[PDB]
Amino acid sequence: MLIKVKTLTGKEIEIDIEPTDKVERIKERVEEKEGIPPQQQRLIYSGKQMNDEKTAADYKILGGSVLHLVLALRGG
Amino acid sequence: EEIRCRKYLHPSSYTKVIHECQQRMVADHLQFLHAECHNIIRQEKKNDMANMYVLLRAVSTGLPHMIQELQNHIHDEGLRATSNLTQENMPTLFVESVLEVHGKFVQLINTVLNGDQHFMSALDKALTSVVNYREPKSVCKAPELLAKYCDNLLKKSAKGMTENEVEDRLTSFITVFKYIDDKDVFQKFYARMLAKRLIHGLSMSMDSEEAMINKLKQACGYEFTSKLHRMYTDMSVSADLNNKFNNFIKNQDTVIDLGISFQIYVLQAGAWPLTQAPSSTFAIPQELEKSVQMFELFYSQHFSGRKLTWLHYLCTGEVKMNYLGKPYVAMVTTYQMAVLLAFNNSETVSYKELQDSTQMNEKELTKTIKSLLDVKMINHDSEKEDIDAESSFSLNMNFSSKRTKFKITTQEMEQTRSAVDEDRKMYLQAAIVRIMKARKVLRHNALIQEVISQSRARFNPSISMIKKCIEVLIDKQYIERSQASADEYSYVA
Amino acid sequence: LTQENMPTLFVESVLEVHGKFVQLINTVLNGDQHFMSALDKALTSVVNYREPKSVCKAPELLAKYCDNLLKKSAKGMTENEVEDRLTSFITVFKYIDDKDVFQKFYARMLAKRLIHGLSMSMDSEEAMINKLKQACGYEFTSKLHRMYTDMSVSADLNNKFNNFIK
Amino acid sequence: RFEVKKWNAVALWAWDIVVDNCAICRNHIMDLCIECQANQASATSEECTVAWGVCNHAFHFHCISRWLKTRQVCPLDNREWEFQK
Amino acid sequence: FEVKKWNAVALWAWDIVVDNCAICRNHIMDLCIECQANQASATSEECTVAWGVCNHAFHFHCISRWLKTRQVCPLDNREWEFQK
Ligand SMILES: [Zn+2]
Ligand SMILES: [Zn+2]
Ligand SMILES: [Zn+2]
Ligand SMILES: [Zn+2]
Ligand SMILES: [Zn+2]
Ligand SMILES: [Zn+2]
C-alpha cells in the first residue's frame, strides 16, 4: 500500500508497504524515495515512533495517511 | 624503429619496415591485447588507451574489438547513470546525466583516442541504447522525460534562468534529443505541454518558444514542427486579433459595450491538440452572450469563411461576489461560471433548475461541483454526500480567502522553488553525518565527493551550499573544525 | 564542384570540414558547447548556401548522394563501407534545415531505386530509412518505410498469387 | 449580484467550406455514425464518440469498430492501429 | 509478337475512402463540381490536379478560386506554393 507521509516541507513518501508489513524496513522504502537512509528516518506514527519490527497493524493499519517524520541524525 | 629506418633506409621502405614491425609485435599478439581491452576500457586508463588506439589502428582488425568494448562501456555507464532516479526530478536529472556522459566520453575520445569517427559512432550507438532504454513489457520513458525537460526549461519558473543560459541549455538539449528513437511521440507530448504552457500565458518568453520550435525545425523536418509552429503563430496573431476586435468595437455604429474584457485566443482547428468538446453541451451565460454574439459578427466580416467551435473547457473568467462582504474575484472556467449564474438570482438552486441555465450533462457537472466544494465556495443544501439529480445548493457564506483574486484548481513559483530547494539542503544534512559514522574524519575537499556520491540517484548538489550547509552543522554543535587542519573535521558524538 | 560528381564530392567536402573543425574544437579549445554551436551555425549557413533568387541545392544534392551510395553500383562498394558513409552522412543531413524537401526528393528517387531493382541490397534501405526515422521521427519516414514495406511483401505476395493460379 | 470582469475565452477556427469527416462512414465527424444514423439512432444513440489513435486520424467509434472486424490497419495510411490518441 | 513476362505495377487504395478536392468535396480523379455545372462549354482538359508543397491534391479550378480570394491551403494554414 502506497503512503502519503508528510515531510519537513509538506512532501510525500512512498512506503509501498501493506498493513502487514513491519515498519522496520517499511520506513526505509518511504525514505528511499526521499533520500534518507533506513536507520535515520525516525518517523512518528501519529503519536509514536516505530521500534524494532513494529508491524504496521500497530499504527491502525492506515492506508497512506500522513506520517510526519523526524530528521533525527546519527541514528545509524 | 621510425628513427632507425629514417637513418638507414631509402624513403620507399620508411613505411614497410614499420608495417612489418607492427605485424610481428602487435598484429601477432592481437588476442593478448584484446583480452586486456576489457581492463583498459572499463577502468578508464586514460594514459594507456592512447597507446592502445595507436597500436591497434596500425593493424587491420585491431580497432573493431576496442570499438565494441568502448561501446559496451558507454552503454553500461549510461545504464549505471540512468538506472534509478527520483520520480520528482526525473526529467532534468536524466537529461543532464546523459549530457554529462556524452560530454565526458566525447572529451575522452577526442583527447585520448584522436577523435576517431568509429569511436564516435560507437558512442552514438551506445547512447541510442541508453537514452531510449525501456523496461520489459513497458513503454519507453525518454520522450516524456525530454518533453517535460523542455517544459521545465521553458516554464516561467523562479530558478533565475537567464535567456542566454536557457538558449545554451536548449542547444545542448538537442544533443540528447537527437538520440530519441521515436520523436513523433516526443512531439505528441511536447505539442501537448506546449498547449498548456502557452494557452495559459505560462511561457516565460514568446521568443524562447520560437527558439525551441526552430531548434526542432532543424533537428527534424519542417512538418515535424508544423503543428508546433501553427500554435505559436496563433498566439502571436491573437494579440493583434484582440486589438482588431477592440477596434471593431470602435466601428461607431451603435453602443456595443460588453462589460467583459474578452481577451480571445482564436486557434487553428487541426494544429492544436485541444480536442473539440466531445460532450458537455453548454449554454452561454447571459453576461457572455453579448461577447460571443458580437465576436461571431467580427469573425464573420474580418475573416470570412470560418466556423468557430468555441471550446469551453479552457476558458477562464473573473467573476466578483454577490455583496457577501469582503468581495473576491474568482479565476474559474466557464464550466465553473454557469453554475454561478442561476446561483445569482436564486440563493437556493436545485440541480434540476440549473439544467435550464447551464445545460451541461452530469458527466462533468459532478466533477466541477466537487472541484468547487474542494475549496468550498458552494455547499450541498441537503445532507447527501454525493450529488444526485434532486440536489440543492446555496452559498457557503462562512467561506473566506486570503486573496481577492484567489486561485481555483483547474507569485507562487518563488515560494515553491525555495521549499523544493530546502529539501535539497535538508537531505544534505541527512547525508554528511553518515560519513561521520563511517570514518569520523574527512577532509574539506574529499567530503564533496562523498556527498555527491550519496546523491547520485538524487538532485545534483551545489558546491557552495555544501560548504554553506556544513557550517550549519558547526553552530548546531554536531561537527566542528580542528584548528590544526582546516580540512580535518571532528564531531562531538 | 564538378557537375558530374557534385553530390558525393560536396557531401565529402562538408563532412571533412566538419570533422577537421570538430577535431580543432576540442583538441585545442577544450570543446566548449559555445564553439560547437558556432560551428553548427557556420556549417548550417555553409550547406544552405544558395544564389539569390534561386532555390537551395542542398536537399537535392544530398538526396542524389544518398541515392548514389544506395544504388546498385559496379564500383564494388561493400556494405560496411556504405553503412559507415551513411552513418557519417547524417552529420551532413542534420544541417539541411530544409529536410521536408529532402524527403520529397529521396522518396522520388527511391521509387525509381525500388521498382527497377537499382537497390544495392534490400537490407541497405533499412540502414537508411532507420537512419532518418531515428534522426527525424517516424512521421518523416512514414512514406519511405511504406515504400520499402511493399517490397518485403511483393515477392511473398507473388508467392500468394502464383499458387493461387495452381 | 454576481458580475464577471474578464473572459479569457478560447476558440478553434476551421474553414467553413472544408468539412472534416470520418473517413469510413463519410459523415460529419462530430455528427452521428452511419450505423448511428440508421439503426441505433432511436434505440440508444449518444455513443458515437470520435475515436483517436496514434495515426492521429478522426474516426467514428462505430465506424472504426466495423473496420477492425477483419483488418487491423488504419484506413487512411495503412499504419498499425492503437486507438490511444 | 509474344511476351514471356511483363512486370506490372499497381497502386492500391481502399474503395471506402477517396482522395477529395476538399474545396469541392468531390473526387480527385473525377471532374470538379464547378465544371460539373456548365460542362458543355468546358473541355475538361485543364482540370488537372494542382499538387502543392503541402503534399495536398486539389482540383486546379478549386484551388485557383481559393487562391483568388484566399492565400493558404484549405486543409492546413500554410502559404500555398504550387509543386506539380
Ligand atoms: Zn464514421
Ligand atoms: Zn455507428
Ligand atoms: Zn491513417
Ligand atoms: Zn475541386
Ligand atoms: Zn474544372
Ligand atoms: Zn496544404
Author numbering:
A (entry chain N): 1 to 76
B (entry chain E): 246 to 655, 663 to 745
C (entry chain C): 330 to 495
D (entry chain F): 21 to 105
E (entry chain J): 22 to 105
Sentences from the paper on this structure:
We recently discovered that FEM1B, a substrate receptor of Cullin 2-RING ligase (CRL2), recognizes C-degrons containing a C-terminal proline. By solving several cryo-EM structures of CRL2FEM1B bound to different C-degrons, we elucidate the dimeric assembly of the complex. Furthermore, we reveal distinct dimerization states of unmodified and neddylated CRL2FEM1B to uncover the NEDD8-mediated activation mechanism of CRL2FEM1B. Our research also indicates that, FEM1B utilizes a bipartite mechanism to recognize both the C-terminal proline and an upstream aromatic residue within the substrate.
Conversely, the installed NEDD8 proteins induce a distinct symmetric dimerization state of N8CRL2FEM1B, named dimerS2. To obtain a higher-resolution structure to unveil the dimerS2 assembly, we collected another cryo-EM dataset for the N8CRL2FEM1B complex bound to the CDK5R1 C-degron and solved the dimerS2 structure of N8CRL2FEM1B-CDK5R1 at an overall resolution of 3.54 Å. Given that the overall architectures of both dimerS2 structures are exactly the same, we used the higher resolution dimerS2 structure of N8CRL2FEM1B-CDK5R1 for structural analysis. The dimerS2 is symmetric and mediated by two NEDD8 molecules, which display weaker density than the other complex subunits, allowing us to build only their main chains. In addition, the two RBX1 molecules, RBX1.p1 and RBX1.p2, interact with each other via symmetric hydrophobic interactions, with Trp35 and Ile37 from one RBX1 contacting Ile44, Trp87, and Val93 of  the other. The conjugation of NEDD8 disrupts the dimera assembly by introducing potential steric clashes, causing structural rearrangement to form a different dimeric assembly, dimerS2. Intriguingly, sequence alignment with the last 23 amino acids of CDK5R1 demonstrated that CDK5R1 also contains the upstream aromatic residue Phe (Phe-22). The binding data indicate that the longer fragment of the CDK5R1 C-degron (23 aa) binds to FEM1B > 5-fold more strongly than the 10-aa fragment (KDs: 1.4 vs. 7.6 μM). In contrast, both C-degrons bind to the FEM1B Ψ pocket mutant (5A) with KDs in the range of 7.8–8.8 μM. This finding suggests that Phe-22 could increase the binding affinity of CDK5R1 for FEM1B by contacting the Ψ pocket.
